[PDB]
Amino acid sequence: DLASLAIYSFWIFLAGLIYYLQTENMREGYPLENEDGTPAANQGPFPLPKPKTFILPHGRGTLTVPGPESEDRPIALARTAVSEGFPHAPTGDPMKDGVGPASWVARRDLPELDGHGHNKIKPMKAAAGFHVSAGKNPIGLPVRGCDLEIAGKVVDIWVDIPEQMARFLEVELKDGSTRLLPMQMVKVQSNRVHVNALSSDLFAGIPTIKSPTEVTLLEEDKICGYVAGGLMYAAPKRKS
Amino acid sequence: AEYQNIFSQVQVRGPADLGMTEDVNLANRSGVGPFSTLLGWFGNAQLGPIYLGSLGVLSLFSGLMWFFTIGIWFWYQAGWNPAVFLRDLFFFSLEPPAPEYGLSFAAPLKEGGLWLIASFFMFVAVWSWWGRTYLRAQALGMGKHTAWAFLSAIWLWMVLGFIRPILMGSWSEAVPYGIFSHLDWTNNFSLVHGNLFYNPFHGLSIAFLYGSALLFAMHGATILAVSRFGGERELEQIADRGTAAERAALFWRWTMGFNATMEGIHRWAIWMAVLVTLTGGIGILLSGTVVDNWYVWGQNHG
Amino acid sequence: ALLSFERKYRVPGGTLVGGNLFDFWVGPFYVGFFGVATFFFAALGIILIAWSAVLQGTWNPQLISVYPPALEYGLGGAPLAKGGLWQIITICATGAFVSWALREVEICRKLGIGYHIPFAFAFAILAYLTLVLFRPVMMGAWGYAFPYGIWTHLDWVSNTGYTYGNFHYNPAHMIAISFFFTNALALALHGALVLSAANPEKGKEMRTPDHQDTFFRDLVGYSIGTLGIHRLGLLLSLSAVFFSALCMIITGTIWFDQWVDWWQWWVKLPWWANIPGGING
Ligand code: BCL
Ligand code: BCL
Ligand code: BCL
Ligand SMILES: CC[C@H]1c2cc3[nH]c4c(c3C)C(=O)[C@H](C(=O)OC)c4c3nc(cc4[nH]c(cc(n2)[C@@H]1C)c(C(C)=O)c4C)[C@@H](C)[C@@H]3CCC(=O)OC/C=C(\C)CCC[C@@H](C)CCC[C@H](C)CCCC(C)C
Ligand SMILES: CC[C@H]1c2cc3[nH]c4c(c3C)C(=O)[C@H](C(=O)OC)c4c3nc(cc4[nH]c(cc(n2)[C@@H]1C)c(C(C)=O)c4C)[C@@H](C)[C@@H]3CCC(=O)OC/C=C(\C)CCC[C@H](C)CCC[C@H](C)CCCC(C)C
Ligand SMILES: COC(C)(C)C(=O)C/C=C(\C)CC/C=C(\C)CC/C=C(\C)CCCC/C(C)=C/CC[C@H](C)CC/C=C(\C)CCC=C(C)C
Ligand SMILES: CCCCCCCCCCCC[N+](C)(C)[O-]
Ligand SMILES: CCCCCCCCCCCC[N+](C)(C)[O-]
Ligand SMILES: [Fe+3]
Numbered sequence: 001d002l003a004s005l006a007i008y009s010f011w012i013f014l015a016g017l018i019y020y021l022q023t024e025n026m027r028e029g030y031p032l033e034n035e036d037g038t039p040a041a042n043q044g045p046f047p048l049p050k051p052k053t054f055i056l057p058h059g060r061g062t063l064t065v066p067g068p069e070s071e072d073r074p075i076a077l078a079r080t081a082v083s084e085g086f087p088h089a090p091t092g093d094p095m096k097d098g099v100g101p102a103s104w105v106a107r108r109d110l111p112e113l114d115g116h117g118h119n120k121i122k123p124m125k126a127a128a129g130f131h132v133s134a135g136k137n138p139i140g141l142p143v144r145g146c147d148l149e150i151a152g153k154v155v156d157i158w159v160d161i162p163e164q165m166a167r168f169l170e171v172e173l174k175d176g177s178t179r180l181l182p183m184q185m186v187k188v189q190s191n192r193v194h195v196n197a198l199s200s201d202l203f204a205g206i207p208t209i210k211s212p213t214e215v216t217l218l219e220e221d222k223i224c225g226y227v228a229g230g231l232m233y234a235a236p237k238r239k240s
Numbered sequence: 241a242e243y244q245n246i247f248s249q250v251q252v253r254g255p256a257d258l259g260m261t262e263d264v265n266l267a268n269r270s271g272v273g274p275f276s277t278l279l280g281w282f283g284n285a286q287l288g289p290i291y292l293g294s295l296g297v298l299s300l301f302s303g304l305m306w307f308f309t310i311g312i313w314f315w316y317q318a319g320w321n322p323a324v325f326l327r328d329l330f331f332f333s334l335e336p337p338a339p340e341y342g343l344s345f346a347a348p349l350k351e352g353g354l355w356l357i358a359s360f361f362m363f364v365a366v367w368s369w370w371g372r373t374y375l376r377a378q379a380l381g382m383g384k385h386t387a388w389a390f391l392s393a394i395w396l397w398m399v400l401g402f403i404r405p406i407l408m409g410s411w412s413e414a415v416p417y418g419i420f421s422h423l424d425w426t427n428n429f430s431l432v433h434g435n436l437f438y439n440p441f442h443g444l445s446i447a448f449l450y451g452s453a454l455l456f457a458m459h460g461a462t463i464l465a466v467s468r469f470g471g472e473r474e475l476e477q478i479a480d481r482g483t484a485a486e487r488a489a490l491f492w493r494w495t496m497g498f499n500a501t502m503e504g505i506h507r508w509a510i511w512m513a514v515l516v517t518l519t520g521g522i523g524i525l526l527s528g529t530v531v532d533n534w535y536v537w538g539q540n541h542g
Numbered sequence: 543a544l545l546s547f548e549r550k551y552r553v554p555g556g557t558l559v560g561g562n563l564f565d566f567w568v569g570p571f572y573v574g575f576f577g578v579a580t581f582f583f584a585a586l587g588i589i590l591i592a593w594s595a596v597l598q599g600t601w602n603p604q605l606i607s608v609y610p611p612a613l614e615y616g617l618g619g620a621p622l623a624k625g626g627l628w629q630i631i632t633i634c635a636t637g638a639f640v641s642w643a644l645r646e647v648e649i650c651r652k653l654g655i656g657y658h659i660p661f662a663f664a665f666a667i668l669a670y671l672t673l674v675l676f677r678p679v680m681m682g683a684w685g686y687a688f689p690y691g692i693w694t695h696l697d698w699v700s701n702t703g704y705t706y707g708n709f710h711y712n713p714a715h716m717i718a719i720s721f722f723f724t725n726a727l728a729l730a731l732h733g734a735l736v737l738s739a740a741n742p743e744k745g746k747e748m749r750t751p752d753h754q755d756t757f758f759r760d761l762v763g764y765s766i767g768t769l770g771i772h773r774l775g776l777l778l779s780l781s782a783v784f785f786s787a788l789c790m791i792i793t794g795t796i797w798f799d800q801w802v803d804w805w806q807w808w809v810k811l812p813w814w815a816n817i818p819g820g821i822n823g
Binding site for chain 2 (some may be wrong): 545547551557569571646649650654656657659661694707710731734738739740743749750751756757761766768769775776779783809811813814821822823
């Protein structure tokens with residue numbers, strides 16, 4: 001009957017749909033590889049989808065996926081076993097090298113632009129008409145690392161103009177240079193800003209930005225990467 | 241403890257954002273509204289502006305007419321007494337015409353006519369608002385996802401109070417406007433058709449509902465888990481994969497064996513939610529038009 | 543075996559239990575100590591389930607059903623064929639679930655992300671525990687739990703419901719449903735919004751998040767924003783399930799009568815209780 005028809009029909013629809021859904025999520029990081037980077041033998045039942053090309057605003061070109069994949073940065077890792085499936089140990093300083101939970105991707109070295117073609121993110125000093133409207137203004141508060149030692153002082157807030165949001169705290173270190181600190185990895189308190197991931201001694205290692213009034217996708221990744229990695233690698237310095 | 245990013249710990253404000261302009265008739269957009277610092281702790285603090293336009297007004301006017309046409313009926317039931325009105329608010333009900341009138345538009349007002357008026361108002365209200373979702377997107381050069389997604393919802397509503405009443409031969413088969421009354425109608429609709437738990441569309445529909453919660457839980461917690469690498473900035477991540485997208489995909493690959501991309505995850509999304517009322521609509525449509533009792537149907541498959 | 547960008551992430555560490563012992567992968571999958579735990583609990587449970595199936599004398603999945611002990615057994619142990627098997631199986635499920643959560647934690651650490659996902663999952667786990675542990679205890683027999691079978695479980699739902707009238711009147715049930723509906727609505731929108739920006743009209747440039755924010759203010763006069771909608775989703779979801787637990791944990795414990803009748807409280811407020819007319823006067 002009709003009902004039987006409809007339901008049998010639907011289970012068929014649903015199956016080609018999953019198939020679709022699945023092949024679309026195969027647009028990045030495919031095809032699969034062996035730990036040595038050579039193409040892996042068994043890529044699953046699903047074919048790579050036919051490529052699609054994105055037209056990036058503000059004449060920043062196009063992006064076609066799937067496409068040629070490459071890390072475009074050295075990886076300082078060495079195998080710890082003779083068969084597949086085991087960890088790869090950092091061969092240096094994982095933090096300094098950017099592997100592990102400290103990994104960063106070679107994103108473009110251009111900043112994210114808003115709808116108008118202006119830098120999406122800005123130090124608040126250069127963002128005409130922005131102010132802390134609620135909560136504790138961090139600016140001026142010392143910054144404490146997981147080792148409970150003071151590392152610097154907030155000397156500005158880098159805001160996201162189109163979404164009117166605090167993205168990073170800029171921090172002034174003992175030598176007078178500054179670093180960005182992701183907003184998402186610090187606790188703003190009444191008399192201090194506490195950073196659990198990094199011990200005071202690692203703040204200097206936080207990668208620097210080439211221009212003082214801009215951050216690029218590459219530098220966001222290298223920074224967030226680094227600060228995140230502290231959680232696992234600063235661990236010996238963290239007390240509480 | 242570590243910061244979780246469920247609530248902002250510092251609010252920043254700037255000049256009211258009047259938004260992108262593209263092909264939008266700026267003459268129709270309103271003025272910026274105030275800013276809720278309340279809202280500001282969760283998401284955006286800025287209210288407005290909003291785009292009015294012809295369809296917005298028609299929609300918005302029919303919308304109120306519907307609501308009011310029901311409202312006066314409730315008052316008439318309450319003996320115009322504000323006390324009764326409050327006491328009995330969920331008990332009042334605007335019911336469709338008796339099965340006697342069939343698909344007739346001639347039912348007396350106290351006997352079903354008022355229900356038709358209200359519905360007519362809702363019909364126009366809803367469709368105009370649909371056209372509104374479409375146009376608003378066109379005027380910014382955007383995909384029409386939202387209008388099509390919306391259409392799914394519309395499907396189930398179309399079926400409940402219009403398509404099924406018409407295929408059954410009478411408006412009396414439609415849903416009454418009322419809080420407790422539309423609950424009862426639902427409960428009763430299952431009893432009559434032999435328990436909707438045997439309607440395999442119903443069962444499918446529940447799977448996608450349950451799933452929507454499962455997924456929006458998964459997606460939300462993930463993006464928050466990697467917002468420490470600017471995860472929420474999904475458009476740029478699509479355009480240039482960040483570590484965020486990577487850690488996201490990998491956490492899931494390592495847990496359950498496969499994974500999404502940042503554009504990908506959102507296709508899972510729109511389809512999981514859209515299938516709820518899509519399947520739903522179908523389950524109800526066959527109910528009583530082709531299948532009288534899902535248990536009996538369940539025994540044979542035919 | 544690895545995604546084109548996976549290797550630099552596959553470093554040692556992050557394990558909660560047992561150091562480097564189980565710190566490794568199997569194909570795409572991460573094992574970890576809890577990798578093993580869940581496997582063991584999952585193996586055992588499925589076994590017991592098959593064992594129930596022979597005692598039942600059917601291999602057909604639409605028929606198989608493992609029932610809790612009957613009320614007469616209260617919160618004591620019961621013979622295998624008479625309810626023990628379900629009790630173990632329930633222990634094993636719990637073992638599986640919790641372990642699966644803790645593995646998520648272990649993966650979280652290795653990758654350096656937040657714990658929001660393990661977090662949200664614990665709500666699912668807590669809803670399940672409500673229906674097979676918290677409610678039966680409080681009620682006083684394993685027998686109030688739902689059976690493990692594809693349709694028999696739908697039956698428990700239907701019977702348990704109709705016991706208190708039309709369950710629709712359970713007030714926390716009303717609230718729990720509003721989230722389920724709301725969440726789906728919001729998942730519908732979010733997905734649609736991002737896709738429409740990433741896949742504009744033919745030949746146009748990728749829209750921007752400014753476009754997302756504008757599209758919605760134009761539509762309903764407000765936009766919760768890209769960080770917001772993700773906070774929103776997590777919340778609606780967790781809330782739906784939170785209220786779902788609540789509506790059950792109260793049902794049969796502190797309220798055992800018809801749910802519709804509980805509304806008489808409102809209608810019988812002395813200030814309008816006796817005023818004539820309307821529906822209730
Ligand atoms: C929480 C609310 C009620 C209840 C009310 C209902 C109602 C009402 C319905 C279901 C439906 C289903 N229920 Mg139930 N269900 C409950 C508790 C459970 C439990 C549990 C351990 O707590 C589980 C595992 C299930 C599982 C299931 C599926 C068989 C089915 C589709 C659900 C779905 O899409 O979810 C979304 C999740 C996903 C898409 C992720 C993938 C889920 C897959 C499908 C899990 C299948 C597991 C199953 C085959 C058993 C495997 C166990 C062993 C390892 C073999 N229910 C409680 C008692 N359930 C629907 C149905 O059609 O089945 C008859 C239906 O109509
Ligand atoms: C006793 C009750 C019966 C039963 C009878 C029914 C009936 C009858 C129906 C459902 C339906 C549904 N049931 Mg059932 N169901 C039962 C038990 C269950 C159980 C359970 C036991 O755990 C669950 C989980 C469900 C779950 C569900 C949903 C999956 C499904 C509706 C999806 C939806 O989101 O529509 C919500 C969305 C809409 C209604 C779309 C409407 C969109 C419109 C356009 C909104 C306009 C707004 C308006 C103009 C006002 C404006 C707003 C103001 C400005 C604020 N049922 C039992 C067996 N169920 C529906 C279905 O699809 O079944 C197959 C349905 O018709
Ligand atoms: C006749 C039926 C009654 C009624 C009786 C009941 C009863 C009784 C119950 C509900 C419950 C619920 N009802 Mg009701 N309800 C009715 C009608 C409805 C309709 C409606 C449109 O009419 C709606 C929308 C709902 C909706 C809902 C939800 C609020 C809730 C179910 C979801 C949930 O609890 O998640 C909770 C989620 C879980 C339990 C899932 C847990 C999953 C676990 C942690 C992991 C699964 C792993 C699995 C084994 C994996 C397999 C391995 C494979 C690899 C996949 N009801 C009518 C009036 N309703 C249920 C509830 O609130 O429970 C607390 C419940 O018990
Ligand atoms: C795919 C399935 C899900 C879905 C999707 C969906 N719904 C949608 C969309 C989509 C994709 C839209 O684009 C469209 C939308 O514009 O949302 C923002 C819509 C929408 N879904 C809505 C509701 C809705 N959707 C529901 C369900 C669902 N929608 C599904 C679960 C439900 C239910 C019953 O679960 C409801 C109630 C609307 C918010 C919106 C469609 C708006 C519309 O058509 O308006 C027409 C008429 C008016 C303008 C009426 C206004 C009259 C009011 C002023 C009266 C009430 C006054 C009241 C007392 C006010 C106070 C409220 C307080 C909280 C402050
Ligand atoms: C809290 C909000 C919602 C939510 C969230 C949620 N679910 C989650 C997560 C999150 C955040 C995960 O991270 C985790 C996941 O990895 O997803 C891919 C998970 C998950 N949610 C799942 C299912 C699921 N979630 C559900 C519900 C929900 N999940 C909510 C609505 C439902 C239902 C019925 O609504 C189901 C069916 C799994 C796909 C996955 C967890 C997988 C897992 O725990 O693996 C360990 C266990 C096994 C491999 C099998 C164990 C076998 C048992 C020992 C025996 C079988 C006993 C069982 C009781 C029989 C039941 C029979 C039925 C017919 C009744
Ligand atoms: C404060 O008092 C005043 C008077 C000021 C008020 O305004 C108060 C007002 C309230 C008390 C209002 C309360 C309103 C509610 C309780 C409403 C509840 C509504 C629902 C629960 C609706 C549920 C389901 C509705 C459904 C499925 C409707 C479907 C409608 C249609 C598909 C429309 C079909 C069209 C019809 C039959 C006519 C078509 C005719 C043509 C010519 C095309
Ligand atoms: C978006 C893809 C995920 C879809 C989930 C498919 C599994 C649902 C199984 C429901 C069992 C249903 N049925 C028809 C017997 O009632
Ligand atoms: C109901 C949800 C079911 C999810 C559908 C299962 C998709 C499995 C995809 C496996 C992909 C294999 N691969 C390529 C990663 O090795
Ligand atoms: Fe998203």
